Write an enzyme that holds these catalytic residues in place. Structure first.
Site, PDB file in Angstrom:
ATOM      1  CG  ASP A 152      25.045  82.062 -10.891  1.00  0.00           C
ATOM      2  OD1 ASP A 152      25.607  82.562  -9.907  1.00  0.00           O
ATOM      3  OD2 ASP A 152      25.400  80.880 -11.241  1.00  0.00           O
ATOM      4  N   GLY A 170      27.581  59.299  -7.932  1.00  0.00           N
ATOM      5  CA  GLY A 170      26.155  59.351  -8.273  1.00  0.00           C
ATOM      6  C   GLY A 170      25.759  58.084  -9.088  1.00  0.00           C
ATOM      7  CB  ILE A 196      27.188  71.744 -15.291  1.00  0.00           C
ATOM      8  CG1 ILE A 196      28.115  70.663 -14.756  1.00  0.00           C
ATOM      9  CG2 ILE A 196      26.189  71.147 -16.306  1.00  0.00           C
ATOM     10  CD1 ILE A 196      28.974  69.901 -15.793  1.00  0.00           C
ATOM     11  CB  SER A 230      26.339  61.704 -12.021  1.00  0.00           C
ATOM     12  OG  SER A 230      26.768  60.320 -12.077  1.00  0.00           O
ATOM     13  CB  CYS A 231      30.154  63.114 -15.069  1.00  0.00           C
ATOM     14  SG  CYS A 231      30.704  63.171 -13.358  1.00  0.00           S
ATOM     15  CB  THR A 232      30.377  58.584 -12.524  1.00  0.00           C
ATOM     16  OG1 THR A 232      31.412  59.511 -12.144  1.00  0.00           O
ATOM     17  CG2 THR A 232      30.935  57.183 -12.426  1.00  0.00           C
ATOM     18  CE  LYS A 262      21.668  82.051  -1.082  1.00  0.00           C
ATOM     19  NZ  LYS A 262      22.475  80.851  -1.447  1.00  0.00           N
ATOM     20  CG  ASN A 302      35.014  65.131 -14.731  1.00  0.00           C
ATOM     21  OD1 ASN A 302      36.095  64.788 -15.196  1.00  0.00           O
ATOM     22  ND2 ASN A 302      34.827  66.234 -14.039  1.00  0.00           N
ATOM     23  CG  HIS A 315      35.473  61.809 -10.562  1.00  0.00           C
ATOM     24  ND1 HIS A 315      35.539  63.196 -10.584  1.00  0.00           N
ATOM     25  CD2 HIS A 315      34.188  61.494 -10.820  1.00  0.00           C
ATOM     26  CE1 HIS A 315      34.349  63.682 -10.884  1.00  0.00           C
ATOM     27  NE2 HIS A 315      33.509  62.665 -11.016  1.00  0.00           N
TER      28      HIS A 315
HETATM   29  N1  NAD Z   1      32.283  67.229 -12.984  1.00  0.00           N
HETATM   30  C1  NAD Z   1      31.286  68.092 -12.865  1.00  0.00           C
HETATM   31  O1  NAD Z   1      31.461  69.289 -12.533  1.00  0.00           O
HETATM   32  C2  NAD Z   1      29.886  67.623 -13.031  1.00  0.00           C
HETATM   33  C3  NAD Z   1      29.556  66.655 -13.947  1.00  0.00           C
HETATM   34  C4  NAD Z   1      28.273  66.193 -14.015  1.00  0.00           C
HETATM   35  C5  NAD Z   1      27.332  66.824 -13.247  1.00  0.00           C
HETATM   36  N2  NAD Z   1      27.694  67.777 -12.417  1.00  0.00           N
HETATM   37  C6  NAD Z   1      26.483  68.259 -11.593  1.00  0.00           C
HETATM   38  O2  NAD Z   1      25.773  69.390 -12.071  1.00  0.00           O
HETATM   39  C7  NAD Z   1      25.568  70.416 -11.109  1.00  0.00           C
HETATM   40  C8  NAD Z   1      26.512  71.633 -11.151  1.00  0.00           C
HETATM   41  O3  NAD Z   1      27.846  71.184 -10.957  1.00  0.00           O
HETATM   42  P1  NAD Z   1      29.055  72.289 -11.233  1.00  0.00           P
HETATM   43  O4  NAD Z   1      30.366  71.431 -11.133  1.00  0.00           O
HETATM   44  O5  NAD Z   1      28.584  73.199 -12.352  1.00  0.00           O
HETATM   45  O6  NAD Z   1      28.971  73.208  -9.899  1.00  0.00           O
HETATM   46  P2  NAD Z   1      29.605  74.725  -9.879  1.00  0.00           P
HETATM   47  O7  NAD Z   1      29.660  74.879  -8.371  1.00  0.00           O
HETATM   48  O8  NAD Z   1      30.723  74.926 -10.718  1.00  0.00           O
HETATM   49  O9  NAD Z   1      28.326  75.575 -10.190  1.00  0.00           O
HETATM   50  C9  NAD Z   1      27.185  75.751  -9.338  1.00  0.00           C
HETATM   51  C10 NAD Z   1      26.683  77.150  -9.835  1.00  0.00           C
HETATM   52  O10 NAD Z   1      25.335  77.349  -9.386  1.00  0.00           O
HETATM   53  C11 NAD Z   1      25.352  78.621  -8.714  1.00  0.00           C
HETATM   54  N3  NAD Z   1      24.335  78.503  -7.652  1.00  0.00           N
HETATM   55  C12 NAD Z   1      24.407  77.830  -6.463  1.00  0.00           C
HETATM   56  N4  NAD Z   1      23.222  77.925  -5.815  1.00  0.00           N
HETATM   57  C13 NAD Z   1      22.403  78.593  -6.609  1.00  0.00           C
HETATM   58  C14 NAD Z   1      21.008  79.026  -6.491  1.00  0.00           C
HETATM   59  N5  NAD Z   1      20.400  78.625  -5.311  1.00  0.00           N
HETATM   60  N6  NAD Z   1      20.479  79.758  -7.529  1.00  0.00           N
HETATM   61  C15 NAD Z   1      21.111  80.082  -8.731  1.00  0.00           C
HETATM   62  N7  NAD Z   1      22.467  79.712  -8.772  1.00  0.00           N
HETATM   63  C16 NAD Z   1      23.114  79.024  -7.826  1.00  0.00           C
HETATM   64  C17 NAD Z   1      26.789  78.866  -8.225  1.00  0.00           C
HETATM   65  O11 NAD Z   1      27.016  80.241  -8.017  1.00  0.00           O
HETATM   66  C18 NAD Z   1      27.635  78.299  -9.334  1.00  0.00           C
HETATM   67  O12 NAD Z   1      27.792  79.312 -10.345  1.00  0.00           O
HETATM   68  C19 NAD Z   1      25.628  69.649  -9.792  1.00  0.00           C
HETATM   69  O13 NAD Z   1      24.252  69.179  -9.516  1.00  0.00           O
HETATM   70  C20 NAD Z   1      26.697  68.602 -10.127  1.00  0.00           C
HETATM   71  O14 NAD Z   1      26.536  67.376  -9.426  1.00  0.00           O
HETATM   72  C21 NAD Z   1      28.853  68.168 -12.267  1.00  0.00           C
HETATM   73  C1  G3H Z   2      29.881  64.464 -12.597  1.00  0.00           C
HETATM   74  O1  G3H Z   2      28.577  64.503 -12.638  1.00  0.00           O
HETATM   75  C2  G3H Z   2      30.345  65.038 -11.242  1.00  0.00           C
HETATM   76  O2  G3H Z   2      31.752  65.171 -11.278  1.00  0.00           O
HETATM   77  C3  G3H Z   2      29.856  64.049 -10.194  1.00  0.00           C
HETATM   78  O3  G3H Z   2      30.654  62.820 -10.300  1.00  0.00           O
HETATM   79  P1  G3H Z   2      29.913  61.375  -9.979  1.00  0.00           P
HETATM   80  O4  G3H Z   2      31.049  60.409  -9.742  1.00  0.00           O
HETATM   81  O5  G3H Z   2      29.148  61.090 -11.234  1.00  0.00           O
HETATM   82  O6  G3H Z   2      28.949  61.730  -8.853  1.00  0.00           O
END
Ligand code: NAD
Ligand code: G3H
Ligand code: G3H
Ligand code: G3H
Ligand code: G3H
Lengths: 334, 335, 337, 333
Positions: B36, B212, B14, B151-153, B80, B317, B179
């Site tokens: 990061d 979510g 994201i 969330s995406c959903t 961290k 998503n 999904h």
């Molecule tokens: N389909 C999707 O991927 C999607 C869609 C909507 C929302 N999201 C949401 O958004 C967020 C990120 O999802 P993502 O798929 O990018 O995850 P991802 O695991 O691809 O990325 C998480 C990133 O954060 C970093 N990280 C973890 N802990 C950390 C910390 N304590 N400090 C700084 N960096 C840290 C990781 O190294 C990684 O680069 C989540 O809250 C997730 O629910 C995801």
């Molecule tokens: C999108 O935010 C990520 O894939 C999480 O999926 P939900 O079904 O929205 O939790």
């Protein structure tokens, strides 16, 4: 009772029919197969299976036969069922697995070629359509052409039967998240008239019709016209899950639904139960037509209106084949 | 002039896409800092080369403590704990919080203690203002400091539910999203926190999973709280998902009426698209909508005075949801 | 001034044929596709052109009629002839046919398009011993009397520039190649008969599947000096597009990895067909490439005991679009001869 | 010694237990060390995406697994030196974490009270065993040994047969290899290796192979004469190694095939096929390596010759069968 079978079409379902007959040590003997491919290629495909692994029995071939577990099975190669020499080895019941004979009128061809009965591995319009341990008591000795509906029908029916018997189903709609199959496409390219069937199956979630939407009403006639649904075809090789959203005839809790389903599954060789956190690969090679999953039950209640979601796993290949075989074993004895 | 300087905490799927989209739209927002756990070398490699979206459209380089993107430096921090991120060094004012570790007002407060002014969380984050752009973004105001984009959903479900609720009423409904697998899941069977199904090989299985949208939806459309439930089936596609909603509505309808109502709701709506083409999930990859309603999958099942209505919308998503995050970000910066 | 040919017909609007159109429009070519021959309805062809699982949405508008596509507002006739000799190419004056069906892979077969009124044919596959071109390897063997020409295969277009560079710098005495190759439409979705080849019958997205490629065997058509010196095969694997060819050679000189990589780097300079990388890329990074081949310096390996030396060189290719970019460069030059 | 401890109950550790029960080994697994709860370990033992339902009963308590009725203690020590192996008398440790791949690191299990360690990976300069190639190098004084890697278990029997029959002068291998847990599900950081960060099920990914360093310890006459690498690809298990060699003799394909066939005769570790198999057909294999005569290729120009030979391997279960063979022998020395 009839003991000699012929298989028309030695594709996924045909091959597994043989596998399951051998596994359960059936008294039924497959005496012949009709298929346009060479015995050498059929033997290769029998022996090596991407989904189920090495065939458990010896496999060899000749110019006009397979030899399976030492037994000879003739391989005919007729394009038209009316020409298959089913009388040659006394093939009495034909398991019609090609997709090209899914009607009484079309499957009559096998009877014309000398068989006594046909069991069609798909929906086949207005004919007796059987999900074993749902409506197999509708069969009698005068039936000559019957369907075992489709894999999804065999998943949905037991679950629908249990809910209907316990609570009443007023109306409902299902969605199966369904392994991709040979009717789809490997790469994007024409696949008859259905646009979505043209799309790369292992790279996409693909909306698709489901044979259950037309077949369920023949299996449980009280639900005819009360249920619709479809599929989302997805990139797993086999193993599927049907979700049904119903309005029921009384108010329920999740526990009550789960209890009723558990009771319906007790000593039911066709319909299993789980409360384990399984995933689709856990259903591969199942010996049920359907495994109800209590972990996924969900009741959404707003006063007078309640939506009940119930979910059952099924192995759309081998699970459905176990059902076909139960129906075949009964069909043979009538 | 808006509050334009942003920091990204979590440069994962994201976070990286946040940057890609801001640059794509030639946003006035400036990303000035990323936090990061990983080196700039690795972050630069990941930004340049993307398995879902292809080569980054701009030059990428790195130094020991920065990325250089299209010739513009972005500081890279490796803290961290968010309270220790030096957001004041480059003047990062709004934090796009994308790590998953700060999904509450109490946790994301750390960014404000570290010198930021506002936080936009890329996930549900409990009882806080939770925004689906072009559904309830008018609930935001200049006093909000920590907000969620659900969330995406939720972004997929909400516009479809808003349309049905406005046109027909929703009495009750249940959703299933088919999904794409995500980073919360497992490559091979192996432990993955406490959730047993999350432990299973994600590209080889259909895996039931919580969504979510199920808690986030009554925050977005309050008239619907308590009226919807749902879940997901995680399946082996890399990105691209589809949400089915089965509803009982407040009036009797035909498929055509349903489709027309949704079509009207998509008109001049940058967040919510419409299709009557027979698309499949790969076709939604790279979508600039949060949700695309698909008229081809509408189904009415009726017996007597009982009617179930199934409506279906696609969403990317990843990138689709990110376009929503960015619309919300752009508005939040101007408030 | 004799103008270059500008009107093309496409026989077969499968993956290659559709991507041919895509690429011509992307490069704003002078060449116009005026007609397509395929047995599928315009409705379905329009659907497939608009929506692509590998490359995403078509970048131009698409519509259709009962007998045409309308692409970027321009009409393209669609014919539905089973026999190439019957295609009415003269109606819209199609001059060069891009022959993409796989059913006419020889001079004898493809000459049917000339009987049907076309002037030249470019075959998107190996087509026996006819003029066979890997652009920027041997395109200067084309001349004005060439009427039917092949662009070989995707794997040939990957292997040949790497083999040419090695042959020119060091000499290739003997070699063998393996391409770890994305699955294609010639394979099967589920286990089931697929003609006579046993391995082609197996589910492509669920298996590593050994498979032929003539790329090495017929490389003498493109690099005559190497004729008979190369062999190889493929391992077809579950990625949708994007492939990598490994070549193990005995060279005519003792070399270091740096020396090999530098020679390849020089060969890729000012070369729109053959790219170079020393980045740690993977297959998805080649999807949509505009090269026929991309040499990867990170994978060069020399194994040597005394005077006995094996050299492994590795090049990526997008077996769909990358190969198509090569087909288009060949077509553009062919049109001017 | 009959009592074993497993450090790491991942893919390899669980399949070690599965294979031990399958062969009805007299080895007794008494303890496992892993940071995860018994609940979750029991669920992963019961349900396997590659090999299906576990063939024995599985249950658990807060600190144990109960497998086919037998209790196995589960400890949760993050450092091997603290694992209390003496409690149930674990004498030989199957070290399956990947964090102790050296003599100096695995010495921790001896300090923790075990007698011997078998490492499920290459581990530097120590005795490194491919069963039915060099298992005769083990003796009673060995305390820390390696079973090399899956790819080494595939390569070694093929290289030994060629070398014994024809001589291998030089060679290079590529394994087209199923993805593993060291890779990434989605694109994201994965230690220091850039290619390991990439989505494994969506890409061909070049990667190192353990066989490059281990093969010279297994077949010392070949040390320095072989190199190679992997292309990791989107299959869940099942892999295939290609070796291209300069041999010391001129050969035909049939002569190569015949030599290989003989090496596989009465050889529980090394199989042979002349059937047109594909990777899914090797899933569940009980060999370390299955030579495939259909892929043999001889490329000759004048008096130059390149020989390509190919062998399949189940990188999970097949390799684990070899580990178990070696373990059974090691326990009796
Ligand atoms: N389909 C999707 O991927 C999607 C869609 C909507 C929302 N999201 C949401 O958004 C967020 C990120 O999802 P993502 O798929 O990018 O995850 P991802 O695991 O691809 O990325 C998480 C990133 O954060 C970093 N990280 C973890 N802990 C950390 C910390 N304590 N400090 C700084 N960096 C840290 C990781 O190294 C990684 O680069 C989540 O809250 C997730 O629910 C995801
Ligand atoms: C999108 O935010 C990520 O894939 C999480 O999926 P939900 O079904 O929205 O939790
Ligand atoms: C099973 O019969 C086959 O996969 C067809 O699926 P349906 O969903 O039953 O049509
Ligand atoms: C590309 O032309 C197609 O995928 C064929 O592959 P080869 O390896 O060239 O035969
Ligand atoms: C098998 O041990 C594991 O997958 C490692 O693969 P190698 O190619 O042997 O390193």
């Amino acid at each position: 009772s009839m003991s000699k079978v012929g298989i028309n079409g030695f594709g996924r379902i045909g091959r597994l029919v043989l596998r399951r007959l051998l596994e359960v040590k059936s008294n039924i003997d497959v005496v012949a197969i009709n298929d346009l491919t060479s015995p050498k290629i059929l033997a290769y495909l029998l022996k090596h299976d991407s989904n189920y692994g090495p065939f458990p029995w010896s496999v060899d071939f000749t110019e006009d036969s397979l030899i399976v577990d030492g037994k000879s099975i003739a391989v005919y190669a007729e394009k038209e069922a009316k020409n298959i020499p089913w009388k040659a080895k006394g093939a009495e019941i034909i398991v019609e697995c090609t997709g090209f004979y899914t009607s009484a009128e079309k499957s009559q061809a096998h009877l014309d070629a000398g068989a006594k009965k046909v069991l069609i591995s798909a929906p086949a319009g207005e004919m007796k359509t059987i999900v074993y341990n749902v409506n197999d008591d509708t069969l009698d000795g005068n039936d000559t052409i019957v369907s075992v509906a489709s894999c999804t029908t065999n998943c949905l029916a037991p679950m629908a039967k249990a809910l209907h018997d316990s609570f009443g189903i007023e109306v409902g709609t299902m969605t199966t998240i369904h392994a991709y199959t040979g009717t789809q496409s490997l790469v994007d390219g024409p696949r008859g008239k259905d646009l979505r069937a043209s799309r790369a199956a292992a790279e996409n979630i693909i909306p698709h019709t489901t044979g259950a939407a037309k077949a369920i009403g023949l299996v449980i006639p009280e639900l005819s016209g009360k249920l619709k649904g479809h599929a989302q075809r997805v990139p797993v090789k086999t193993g599927s899950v049907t979700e049904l959203v119903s309005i029921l005839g009384k108010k329920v809790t999740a526990e009550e639904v789960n209890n009723a389903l558990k009771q319906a599954t007790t000593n039911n060789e066709s319909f299993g139960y789980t409360d384990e956190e399984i995933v689709s690969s856990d259903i591969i090679g199942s010996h049920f037509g359907s495994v109800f999953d209590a972990t996924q039950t969900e009741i959404t209640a707003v006063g007078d209106l309640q939506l009940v979601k119930t979910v059952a796993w099924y192995d759309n290949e081998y699970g459905f084949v176990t059902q076909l075989i139960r129906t075949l074993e009964k069909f043979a004895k009538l």
